[PDB]
Amino acid sequence: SAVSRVNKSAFNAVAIDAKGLHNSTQNLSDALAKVPGLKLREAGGVGSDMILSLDGFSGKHVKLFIDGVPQEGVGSSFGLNNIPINFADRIEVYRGVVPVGFGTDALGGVINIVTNKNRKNWFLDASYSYGSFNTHKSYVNFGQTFKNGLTYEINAFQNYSDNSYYVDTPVEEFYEGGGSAINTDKVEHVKRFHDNYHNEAVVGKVGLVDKKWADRLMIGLTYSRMYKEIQTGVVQKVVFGEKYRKGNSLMPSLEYRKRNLFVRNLDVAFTANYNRNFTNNVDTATYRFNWLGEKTSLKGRKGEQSYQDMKSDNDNWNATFTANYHIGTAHTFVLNHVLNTFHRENAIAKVTRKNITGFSYRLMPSEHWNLSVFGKYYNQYNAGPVSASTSGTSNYVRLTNNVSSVGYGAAGTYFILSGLQAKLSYEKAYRLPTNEELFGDEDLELGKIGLNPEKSDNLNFNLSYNRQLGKHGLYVETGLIYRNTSDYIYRSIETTSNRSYGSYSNYGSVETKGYHISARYNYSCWVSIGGNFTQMDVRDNVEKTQTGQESLTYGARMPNLPYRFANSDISFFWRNLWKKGNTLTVTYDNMYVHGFPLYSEALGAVETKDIVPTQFSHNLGITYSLKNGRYNVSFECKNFTDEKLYDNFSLQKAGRAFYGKVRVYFGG
Amino acid sequence: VQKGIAITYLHVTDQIMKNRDVIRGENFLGNGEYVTFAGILEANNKIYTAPIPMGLSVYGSAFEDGKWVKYPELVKTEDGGSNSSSYEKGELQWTQYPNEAWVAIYNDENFNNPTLIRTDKISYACGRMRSQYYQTIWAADNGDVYVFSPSYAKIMDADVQKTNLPAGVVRIKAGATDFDSYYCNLEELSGGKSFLRCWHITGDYFLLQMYTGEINSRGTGATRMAVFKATGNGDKGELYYVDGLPEPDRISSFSGTPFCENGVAYVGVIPITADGETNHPAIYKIDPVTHTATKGLTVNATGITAIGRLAKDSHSTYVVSATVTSANSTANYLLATSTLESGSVTPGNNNGFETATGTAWIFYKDQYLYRLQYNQGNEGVTTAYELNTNGGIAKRSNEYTITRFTTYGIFGENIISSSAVDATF
């Protein structure tokens, strides 16, 4: 229903029901990996550095929410790559055009994780999983509501792994004479020894529901902690043996929600959140390690990369207000406002305060077509210390900055036939400048220059056909995307000209054109086949260089970015196998990624270029369920052909892996 | 915790990296302050280095109840500062003796028992640009060592830490262990200007990159070049600005290290191109006798990192290391040419040897080209390149993992990289 309403909306949105994945060992990112146009790039292993890309936009251009709460101010101890899929009821992805109700600046798109808010009077859920490289993952979720309206819920989970899988790499030999060297002509098959990771999280919520003065009033508290061991650097040849990182996060929250506040059909929601994060990076070893686990003394030098015992503690807080109104089914109105304040400083504080307002109206005069128009107002305030001296390190003053912009968009859909739908969407999106870009130089004169926000024109077209023919069920969708982005904030080139320039500038333009195909066939309830294909071109769109010369890379593909990929799966179901209510599932999955170069494709001899190879991997899973999901056992084999996989250039990922999961659920 | 000097050797012939036991830098010059080595100058079968004072550290400022602290008001009371130049609590940042220069002489690349000599005519001898230290001690063709000083300590916030010595030149004669009577005031020959960098050209000719405005930490205004002849005006030094280069307003940057050959210099020049023009980065030949520049080979890239020669078994070629930056990503390309005086070269249309950017580039004779890079970055290894048997550029087999360095040089068969680090003794 909710997944259906998201899928059939006029926006280019994809809704995935996570309840069908609760018996697997996946995280949120693994579930998101199946969305068309969405790519995951992980350094390798559990808890590794993960980058999510949507239509070519990555990092700061894609925004994440959990039940409408922005997550850009949450630490790494509670993130997409380390939360179990059991945490989510469903996942919504909005590509390019974002509906009013989120209040954020996102050129790329929005991902929203929706949890289960329709629990029973009492419920318990527990799962444990054991794996290949000493992997232990456990999850518990229990709660209950009483007849007086009081309700509570508790979530807890932990992930642990050694990440002790094998990689192929040249090793640094320590010679008997006291020297050392890495011979590239010799490649060894070595196991990972300093890659252990583990994170833990607890969430607790308590409140009141179904009251005359509040439909939902809840207070929540989340605590997360994380420990990581750094195994390599940017390239695999650099290896470490003692460097590590720690972190923790504390997150209180308040939510209020009511329907028909003062007049009929007027719904109101208010939400407030506070996040405190702590980080600790330690690099204090006195030895140099190689890939065999051996050690050699650094001869008085401390820090295998750079001596560091750094501790940081940051804080931020956000507030959200949403109001919905409607006159029948033909007229719908949405008003939203989000405030978000960040304090980077671990007398002048580096303060960022962002205010975003949105208004949307939908007209639906019939069941054949509907149209939505919306407008958004963006306002950012930045404040930082800047110096005015010969060396600029003695006298400091406050320097403030204000950036405002107006965005707008529309989205319409038309039902040509009973099962044929056509969507068309457009938005003008922004990405506002950050405090570090504005005041990085910490110079009074360079601070006054300022930066314009990055801007993008996003256009979407979709055509979908859905039909049921007896026992056959078919769904086909095709889509076209156009992105036009300008005013990218890039690093400036180091110069010694008579004119002084800041460390960042509004210089950069990218033109993206792409299409996607999705198919899903079902027969009765025992065979399901499906697949997605994505093909896009992302071109550098800057004619001249920063010094005024013709650019060599103008019109060429943007480097270090996969642009063609596909995924497919087939599932078989045997219901009432051994008794009524027991079911057996066998699922096959595969992923295809086309190779891409590390640097611009138009430069350098082809035989000397660093390239990521084309990759095609396969996955298998088997599940057995008893008493209508009361007891569940699962076995999975990942990369069952043992392929060499690389999301990043030289960072190898795990090979063949085996996992086993047991899960129980009770409720009433 | 104490401050020390870390020295690393790359032996060229046998492809081995070695680390030397960290030298104690605390009270290196006899006044409690730790130093950083600028320049590793091979001359007269000896090593000349400029130990530049770095002020007092946390250990130095608390030593024997503040024995070394001359200005207690300058000692940091709070832990803060920009990450590039962040400071800890209880340390004195810059040197408190800015009116002198020191030179250390070693007999081999084992760095034992330095011979320290002091002069009070010039401030410390090194160019400075943000976090970058530039060598300003050089050697003439007859063995004499010339020590140049730009007086950068003139832009210190504290007046006690400002120097009053104008930018100048002193000399150490070949086979001597002390400064002679030679002095030259460069701020009297250049109209009250200082310099950012200096190199040797040929004989006693030197090339100086001169400021057009005031000396500063970001290098703004260093858009002119001059030729200095040490024994010009009857052993008094003479300075002539170079002719033929583009105007200072039309210059974005120069190459880091020029290439000296046949009594002339080759410098990479990056211009600012007027709307409608087609000015591309090029290689300019500078003749020191007539102090004139001539445009030569055209380089179609956004930066130039190295110019040199490579030869192997009856093959020889000029190598230009060009840099291309786009999409907020940067790559380096080795381009082979037969001349540095005509023609054009580009990495476009899939040309050149593609590598990642390195922190330093250094040619070992016409035998090798070394890309120096520490643990951090896109590719945190030190690599080397040569010519294969049939005239093509190839990469040497061995690679190395080195610590961060602030100076580098060549002595004998070793490439030496040095920095100042934290250490325990």
mmCIF file of C-alpha atoms in Angstrom, chain A residues 317-628:
data_model
loop_
_atom_site.group_PDB
_atom_site.id
_atom_site.type_symbol
_atom_site.label_atom_id
_atom_site.label_comp_id
_atom_site.label_asym_id
_atom_site.label_seq_id
_atom_site.Cartn_x
_atom_site.Cartn_y
_atom_site.Cartn_z
ATOM 1 C CA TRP A 317 20.710 19.943 16.717
ATOM 2 C CA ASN A 318 17.759 20.160 14.342
ATOM 3 C CA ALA A 319 14.036 20.906 14.414
ATOM 4 C CA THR A 320 11.325 20.039 11.893
ATOM 5 C CA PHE A 321 7.731 21.213 11.439
ATOM 6 C CA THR A 322 5.226 19.814 8.940
ATOM 7 C CA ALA A 323 1.593 20.727 8.250
ATOM 8 C CA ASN A 324 -0.740 18.911 5.850
ATOM 9 C CA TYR A 325 -4.152 20.040 4.630
ATOM 10 C CA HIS A 326 -6.547 18.868 1.947
ATOM 11 C CA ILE A 327 -9.915 19.839 0.497
ATOM 12 C CA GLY A 328 -11.342 16.491 -0.502
ATOM 13 C CA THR A 329 -9.092 14.406 -2.733
ATOM 14 C CA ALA A 330 -8.614 17.017 -5.483
ATOM 15 C CA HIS A 331 -6.607 19.618 -3.516
ATOM 16 C CA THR A 332 -3.618 18.837 -1.282
ATOM 17 C CA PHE A 333 -1.371 21.338 0.541
ATOM 18 C CA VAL A 334 1.929 20.682 2.346
ATOM 19 C CA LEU A 335 3.978 23.191 4.369
ATOM 20 C CA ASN A 336 7.368 22.317 5.858
ATOM 21 C CA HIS A 337 10.207 24.018 7.718
ATOM 22 C CA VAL A 338 13.555 22.640 8.896
ATOM 23 C CA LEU A 339 16.185 24.315 11.083
ATOM 24 C CA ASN A 340 19.621 22.713 11.471
ATOM 25 C CA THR A 341 22.509 24.062 13.568
ATOM 26 C CA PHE A 342 26.075 22.684 13.612
ATOM 27 C CA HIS A 343 28.982 23.676 15.887
ATOM 28 C CA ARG A 344 32.290 22.508 14.396
ATOM 29 C CA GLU A 345 34.443 23.865 17.255
ATOM 30 C CA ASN A 346 35.517 20.916 19.399
ATOM 31 C CA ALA A 347 36.193 32.885 21.797
ATOM 32 C CA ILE A 348 34.959 32.802 18.198
ATOM 33 C CA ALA A 349 33.018 29.661 17.293
ATOM 34 C CA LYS A 350 32.651 28.230 13.789
ATOM 35 C CA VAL A 351 28.850 28.096 13.595
ATOM 36 C CA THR A 352 26.579 27.011 10.740
ATOM 37 C CA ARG A 353 22.805 27.540 10.841
ATOM 38 C CA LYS A 354 20.550 26.442 7.974
ATOM 39 C CA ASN A 355 16.849 27.218 7.453
ATOM 40 C CA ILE A 356 14.804 25.631 4.665
ATOM 41 C CA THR A 357 11.104 26.227 3.986
ATOM 42 C CA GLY A 358 8.887 24.399 1.508
ATOM 43 C CA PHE A 359 5.349 24.644 0.135
ATOM 44 C CA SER A 360 3.640 22.201 -2.227
ATOM 45 C CA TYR A 361 0.208 21.919 -3.836
ATOM 46 C CA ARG A 362 -1.296 18.977 -5.729
ATOM 47 C CA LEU A 363 -4.335 19.024 -8.018
ATOM 48 C CA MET A 364 -5.985 15.640 -8.706
ATOM 49 C CA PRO A 365 -9.296 16.323 -10.490
ATOM 50 C CA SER A 366 -9.610 12.692 -11.650
ATOM 51 C CA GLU A 367 -7.989 9.264 -11.445
ATOM 52 C CA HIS A 368 -6.390 9.739 -14.885
ATOM 53 C CA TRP A 369 -3.835 12.462 -14.114
ATOM 54 C CA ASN A 370 -2.490 14.672 -11.358
ATOM 55 C CA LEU A 371 -0.069 17.580 -11.089
ATOM 56 C CA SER A 372 2.035 19.027 -8.261
ATOM 57 C CA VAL A 373 3.849 22.366 -8.015
ATOM 58 C CA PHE A 374 6.211 23.319 -5.206
ATOM 59 C CA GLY A 375 8.615 26.016 -4.110
ATOM 60 C CA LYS A 376 11.422 26.063 -1.561
ATOM 61 C CA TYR A 377 13.414 28.806 0.168
ATOM 62 C CA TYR A 378 17.001 28.176 1.314
ATOM 63 C CA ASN A 379 18.897 30.342 3.806
ATOM 64 C CA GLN A 380 22.295 29.635 5.377
ATOM 65 C CA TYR A 381 24.258 31.628 7.954
ATOM 66 C CA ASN A 382 27.963 30.942 8.509
ATOM 67 C CA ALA A 383 30.251 32.454 11.140
ATOM 68 C CA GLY A 384 33.977 32.029 11.688
ATOM 69 C CA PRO A 385 37.209 33.588 12.938
ATOM 70 C CA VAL A 386 39.403 35.437 10.448
ATOM 71 C CA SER A 387 42.741 37.176 10.917
ATOM 72 C CA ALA A 388 44.244 40.410 9.565
ATOM 73 C CA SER A 389 48.020 40.402 10.067
ATOM 74 C CA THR A 390 51.290 39.903 8.204
ATOM 75 C CA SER A 391 51.168 36.165 8.955
ATOM 76 C CA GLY A 392 47.469 36.122 9.890
ATOM 77 C CA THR A 393 47.885 34.247 13.179
ATOM 78 C CA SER A 394 47.716 36.940 15.899
ATOM 79 C CA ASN A 395 44.572 39.109 15.695
ATOM 80 C CA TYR A 396 41.184 37.479 15.104
ATOM 81 C CA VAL A 397 37.708 38.868 14.418
ATOM 82 C CA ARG A 398 34.267 37.476 13.643
ATOM 83 C CA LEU A 399 33.275 37.181 9.986
ATOM 84 C CA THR A 400 29.687 36.325 9.045
ATOM 85 C CA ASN A 401 28.125 35.176 5.785
ATOM 86 C CA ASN A 402 24.569 34.806 4.482
ATOM 87 C CA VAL A 403 23.436 32.854 1.412
ATOM 88 C CA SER A 404 19.828 32.728 0.210
ATOM 89 C CA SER A 405 18.206 31.057 -2.778
ATOM 90 C CA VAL A 406 14.837 30.008 -4.193
ATOM 91 C CA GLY A 407 14.148 26.590 -5.680
ATOM 92 C CA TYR A 408 11.069 25.341 -7.511
ATOM 93 C CA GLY A 409 9.696 22.330 -9.307
ATOM 94 C CA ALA A 410 6.764 20.437 -10.741
ATOM 95 C CA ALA A 411 5.716 16.813 -11.152
ATOM 96 C CA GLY A 412 2.874 15.377 -13.212
ATOM 97 C CA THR A 413 1.599 11.927 -14.049
ATOM 98 C CA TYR A 414 -0.917 10.663 -16.604
ATOM 99 C CA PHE A 415 -2.506 7.203 -16.860
ATOM 100 C CA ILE A 416 -2.734 6.502 -20.593
ATOM 101 C CA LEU A 417 -4.329 3.077 -20.070
ATOM 102 C CA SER A 418 -5.462 0.891 -17.167
ATOM 103 C CA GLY A 419 -1.913 -0.257 -16.384
ATOM 104 C CA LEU A 420 0.188 2.268 -18.340
ATOM 105 C CA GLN A 421 1.564 5.340 -16.556
ATOM 106 C CA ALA A 422 3.753 8.240 -17.696
ATOM 107 C CA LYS A 423 5.594 10.567 -15.299
ATOM 108 C CA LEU A 424 7.362 13.890 -15.889
ATOM 109 C CA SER A 425 9.248 15.787 -13.176
ATOM 110 C CA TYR A 426 11.494 18.846 -12.901
ATOM 111 C CA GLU A 427 13.338 20.584 -10.070
ATOM 112 C CA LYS A 428 15.961 23.306 -9.627
ATOM 113 C CA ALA A 429 18.149 22.193 -6.715
ATOM 114 C CA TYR A 430 20.926 23.770 -4.649
ATOM 115 C CA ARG A 431 23.860 22.785 -2.448
ATOM 116 C CA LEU A 432 24.790 25.546 -0.020
ATOM 117 C CA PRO A 433 28.441 26.326 0.815
ATOM 118 C CA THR A 434 29.987 25.067 4.041
ATOM 119 C CA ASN A 435 31.872 26.894 6.776
ATOM 120 C CA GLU A 436 35.189 25.217 5.929
ATOM 121 C CA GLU A 437 35.005 26.300 2.285
ATOM 122 C CA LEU A 438 34.116 29.889 3.206
ATOM 123 C CA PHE A 439 36.577 30.407 6.080
ATOM 124 C CA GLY A 440 39.233 27.763 5.426
ATOM 125 C CA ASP A 441 41.976 30.296 4.711
ATOM 126 C CA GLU A 442 41.095 32.167 7.944
ATOM 127 C CA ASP A 443 42.018 35.433 6.199
ATOM 128 C CA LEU A 444 39.902 38.575 6.527
ATOM 129 C CA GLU A 445 40.195 39.657 2.888
ATOM 130 C CA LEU A 446 39.760 36.171 1.420
ATOM 131 C CA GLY A 447 36.710 35.608 3.621
ATOM 132 C CA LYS A 448 34.757 38.499 2.097
ATOM 133 C CA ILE A 449 34.902 36.900 -1.372
ATOM 134 C CA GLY A 450 32.223 34.341 -0.528
ATOM 135 C CA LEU A 451 30.920 31.425 -2.563
ATOM 136 C CA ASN A 452 27.753 30.864 -4.557
ATOM 137 C CA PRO A 453 25.775 27.672 -3.884
ATOM 138 C CA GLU A 454 26.084 24.857 -6.392
ATOM 139 C CA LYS A 455 22.996 24.563 -8.582
ATOM 140 C CA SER A 456 21.438 21.859 -10.730
ATOM 141 C CA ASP A 457 18.608 21.432 -13.225
ATOM 142 C CA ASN A 458 16.991 17.994 -12.866
ATOM 143 C CA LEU A 459 14.538 16.512 -15.385
ATOM 144 C CA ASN A 460 12.924 13.061 -15.191
ATOM 145 C CA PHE A 461 10.684 11.064 -17.531
ATOM 146 C CA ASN A 462 9.256 7.622 -16.768
ATOM 147 C CA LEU A 463 6.975 5.118 -18.484
ATOM 148 C CA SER A 464 5.719 2.063 -16.590
ATOM 149 C CA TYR A 465 3.456 -0.842 -17.560
ATOM 150 C CA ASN A 466 1.922 -3.264 -15.053
ATOM 151 C CA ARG A 467 -0.427 -6.136 -15.814
ATOM 152 C CA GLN A 468 -1.917 -9.307 -14.347
ATOM 153 C CA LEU A 469 -2.768 -12.050 -16.868
ATOM 154 C CA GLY A 470 -4.239 -14.969 -14.950
ATOM 155 C CA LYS A 471 -1.370 -16.487 -12.980
ATOM 156 C CA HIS A 472 1.205 -14.383 -14.863
ATOM 157 C CA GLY A 473 2.217 -11.040 -13.393
ATOM 158 C CA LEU A 474 4.356 -8.576 -15.331
ATOM 159 C CA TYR A 475 5.905 -5.205 -14.525
ATOM 160 C CA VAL A 476 8.158 -3.234 -16.888
ATOM 161 C CA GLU A 477 9.544 0.272 -16.401
ATOM 162 C CA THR A 478 11.817 2.529 -18.442
ATOM 163 C CA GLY A 479 13.192 5.915 -17.464
ATOM 164 C CA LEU A 480 15.233 8.857 -18.753
ATOM 165 C CA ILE A 481 17.217 11.302 -16.594
ATOM 166 C CA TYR A 482 18.863 14.641 -17.414
ATOM 167 C CA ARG A 483 21.104 16.535 -14.975
ATOM 168 C CA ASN A 484 22.762 19.901 -15.638
ATOM 169 C CA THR A 485 24.983 21.016 -12.741
ATOM 170 C CA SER A 486 26.982 24.239 -12.421
ATOM 171 C CA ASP A 487 28.917 26.295 -9.854
ATOM 172 C CA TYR A 488 30.767 23.321 -8.376
ATOM 173 C CA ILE A 489 32.994 24.342 -5.466
ATOM 174 C CA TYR A 490 36.466 23.015 -6.273
ATOM 175 C CA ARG A 491 39.945 23.299 -4.822
ATOM 176 C CA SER A 492 41.969 26.121 -6.348
ATOM 177 C CA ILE A 493 45.283 25.542 -8.110
ATOM 178 C CA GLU A 494 48.354 26.784 -6.251
ATOM 179 C CA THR A 495 49.637 29.980 -7.886
ATOM 180 C CA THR A 496 52.017 32.863 -7.182
ATOM 181 C CA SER A 497 50.221 35.499 -9.261
ATOM 182 C CA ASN A 498 49.958 39.133 -8.202
ATOM 183 C CA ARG A 499 46.285 38.428 -7.410
ATOM 184 C CA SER A 500 45.308 36.401 -4.342
ATOM 185 C CA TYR A 501 42.653 33.681 -4.550
ATOM 186 C CA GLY A 502 40.818 31.610 -1.976
ATOM 187 C CA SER A 503 41.278 27.889 -1.466
ATOM 188 C CA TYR A 504 37.889 27.170 -3.094
ATOM 189 C CA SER A 505 36.007 28.586 -6.048
ATOM 190 C CA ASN A 506 32.737 28.182 -7.945
ATOM 191 C CA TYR A 507 34.254 26.440 -10.958
ATOM 192 C CA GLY A 508 32.867 23.252 -12.460
ATOM 193 C CA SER A 509 29.981 22.015 -14.592
ATOM 194 C CA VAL A 510 28.752 18.486 -15.292
ATOM 195 C CA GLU A 511 26.179 17.271 -17.823
ATOM 196 C CA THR A 512 24.562 13.879 -17.201
ATOM 197 C CA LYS A 513 22.243 11.919 -19.488
ATOM 198 C CA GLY A 514 21.000 8.464 -18.665
ATOM 199 C CA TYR A 515 18.396 5.753 -18.917
ATOM 200 C CA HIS A 516 17.310 2.731 -16.908
ATOM 201 C CA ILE A 517 15.245 -0.411 -17.503
ATOM 202 C CA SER A 518 13.554 -2.541 -14.833
ATOM 203 C CA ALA A 519 11.597 -5.784 -15.160
ATOM 204 C CA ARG A 520 9.782 -8.124 -12.768
ATOM 205 C CA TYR A 521 7.893 -11.293 -13.751
ATOM 206 C CA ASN A 522 5.981 -13.474 -11.292
ATOM 207 C CA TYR A 523 4.185 -16.766 -11.858
ATOM 208 C CA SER A 524 1.613 -17.664 -9.199
ATOM 209 C CA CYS A 525 3.597 -17.732 -5.959
ATOM 210 C CA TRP A 526 6.550 -20.049 -6.668
ATOM 211 C CA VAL A 527 8.800 -18.251 -9.185
ATOM 212 C CA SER A 528 9.873 -14.597 -9.294
ATOM 213 C CA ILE A 529 12.412 -13.166 -11.754
ATOM 214 C CA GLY A 530 13.650 -9.598 -11.917
ATOM 215 C CA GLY A 531 16.386 -7.270 -13.031
ATOM 216 C CA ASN A 532 17.633 -3.707 -13.403
ATOM 217 C CA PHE A 533 19.944 -2.112 -15.988
ATOM 218 C CA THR A 534 21.448 1.393 -15.803
ATOM 219 C CA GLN A 535 23.394 3.199 -18.542
ATOM 220 C CA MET A 536 24.461 6.833 -18.146
ATOM 221 C CA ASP A 537 27.047 9.248 -19.521
ATOM 222 C CA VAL A 538 28.508 11.937 -17.257
ATOM 223 C CA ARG A 539 30.493 14.559 -19.172
ATOM 224 C CA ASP A 540 32.815 17.317 -18.026
ATOM 225 C CA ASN A 541 31.093 20.500 -19.178
ATOM 226 C CA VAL A 542 33.745 23.198 -18.602
ATOM 227 C CA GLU A 543 35.272 24.612 -21.783
ATOM 228 C CA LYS A 544 38.171 26.642 -20.349
ATOM 229 C CA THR A 545 40.713 26.125 -17.582
ATOM 230 C CA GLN A 546 41.125 28.290 -14.483
ATOM 231 C CA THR A 547 43.875 30.270 -16.252
ATOM 232 C CA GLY A 548 41.834 30.709 -19.443
ATOM 233 C CA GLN A 549 43.085 27.959 -21.776
ATOM 234 C CA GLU A 550 41.026 25.393 -23.659
ATOM 235 C CA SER A 551 40.381 22.402 -21.407
ATOM 236 C CA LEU A 552 41.760 19.032 -22.480
ATOM 237 C CA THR A 553 39.011 17.092 -20.668
ATOM 238 C CA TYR A 554 36.048 19.109 -21.974
ATOM 239 C CA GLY A 555 33.294 16.810 -23.213
ATOM 240 C CA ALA A 556 34.900 13.667 -21.764
ATOM 241 C CA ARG A 557 33.508 11.182 -19.263
ATOM 242 C CA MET A 558 33.952 12.098 -15.608
ATOM 243 C CA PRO A 559 36.719 9.816 -14.279
ATOM 244 C CA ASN A 560 36.613 7.386 -11.353
ATOM 245 C CA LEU A 561 32.873 6.830 -11.748
ATOM 246 C CA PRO A 562 31.081 3.636 -12.849
ATOM 247 C CA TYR A 563 28.451 4.407 -15.475
ATOM 248 C CA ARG A 564 26.961 1.081 -16.656
ATOM 249 C CA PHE A 565 25.738 -1.566 -14.246
ATOM 250 C CA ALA A 566 23.065 -4.204 -13.822
ATOM 251 C CA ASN A 567 21.680 -6.666 -11.305
ATOM 252 C CA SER A 568 19.350 -9.643 -11.521
ATOM 253 C CA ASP A 569 17.701 -12.223 -9.287
ATOM 254 C CA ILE A 570 15.500 -15.325 -9.376
ATOM 255 C CA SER A 571 13.581 -16.737 -6.402
ATOM 256 C CA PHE A 572 11.788 -20.062 -5.934
ATOM 257 C CA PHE A 573 9.173 -20.656 -3.236
ATOM 258 C CA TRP A 574 7.846 -23.952 -1.845
ATOM 259 C CA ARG A 575 5.000 -23.210 0.561
ATOM 260 C CA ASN A 576 3.460 -25.798 2.898
ATOM 261 C CA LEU A 577 6.577 -27.901 2.309
ATOM 262 C CA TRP A 578 6.608 -30.241 5.318
ATOM 263 C CA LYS A 579 3.614 -28.827 7.205
ATOM 264 C CA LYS A 580 1.146 -26.035 6.517
ATOM 265 C CA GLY A 581 2.742 -22.681 7.297
ATOM 266 C CA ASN A 582 6.320 -23.814 6.575
ATOM 267 C CA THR A 583 8.012 -22.387 3.487
ATOM 268 C CA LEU A 584 11.316 -22.887 1.673
ATOM 269 C CA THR A 585 12.964 -20.107 -0.344
ATOM 270 C CA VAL A 586 15.881 -20.437 -2.767
ATOM 271 C CA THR A 587 17.269 -17.162 -4.130
ATOM 272 C CA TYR A 588 19.944 -16.548 -6.771
ATOM 273 C CA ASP A 589 21.409 -13.078 -7.311
ATOM 274 C CA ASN A 590 24.043 -11.498 -9.535
ATOM 275 C CA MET A 591 25.746 -8.125 -9.991
ATOM 276 C CA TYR A 592 27.456 -6.665 -13.082
ATOM 277 C CA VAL A 593 29.683 -3.567 -13.145
ATOM 278 C CA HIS A 594 31.460 -2.197 -16.217
ATOM 279 C CA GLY A 595 35.078 -1.150 -15.865
ATOM 280 C CA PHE A 596 36.135 2.489 -15.674
ATOM 281 C CA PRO A 597 39.455 4.357 -15.497
ATOM 282 C CA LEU A 598 40.866 6.063 -12.426
ATOM 283 C CA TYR A 599 41.842 9.226 -14.338
ATOM 284 C CA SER A 600 40.441 11.045 -17.364
ATOM 285 C CA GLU A 601 39.910 8.642 -20.261
ATOM 286 C CA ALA A 602 41.303 11.086 -22.845
ATOM 287 C CA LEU A 603 44.773 11.466 -21.282
ATOM 288 C CA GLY A 604 47.797 9.184 -21.156
ATOM 289 C CA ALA A 605 48.777 6.060 -23.040
ATOM 290 C CA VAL A 606 46.171 3.357 -22.491
ATOM 291 C CA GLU A 607 48.687 0.743 -21.319
ATOM 292 C CA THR A 608 49.912 3.075 -18.536
ATOM 293 C CA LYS A 609 46.475 3.985 -17.137
ATOM 294 C CA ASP A 610 45.016 2.755 -13.850
ATOM 295 C CA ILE A 611 41.742 0.962 -14.643
ATOM 296 C CA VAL A 612 39.102 -0.828 -12.565
ATOM 297 C CA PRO A 613 38.184 -4.089 -14.350
ATOM 298 C CA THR A 614 34.760 -5.285 -15.431
ATOM 299 C CA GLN A 615 33.174 -7.412 -12.713
ATOM 300 C CA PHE A 616 30.387 -10.006 -12.512
ATOM 301 C CA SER A 617 29.644 -11.740 -9.200
ATOM 302 C CA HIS A 618 27.039 -14.251 -8.032
ATOM 303 C CA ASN A 619 25.218 -14.879 -4.726
ATOM 304 C CA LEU A 620 23.067 -17.721 -3.383
ATOM 305 C CA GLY A 621 20.723 -18.028 -0.416
ATOM 306 C CA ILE A 622 18.388 -20.589 1.149
ATOM 307 C CA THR A 623 15.782 -19.962 3.863
ATOM 308 C CA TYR A 624 13.355 -22.195 5.756
ATOM 309 C CA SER A 625 10.495 -20.766 7.829
ATOM 310 C CA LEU A 626 8.236 -22.463 10.384
ATOM 311 C CA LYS A 627 4.815 -21.511 11.789
ATOM 312 C CA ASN A 628 4.285 -18.492 9.510
#
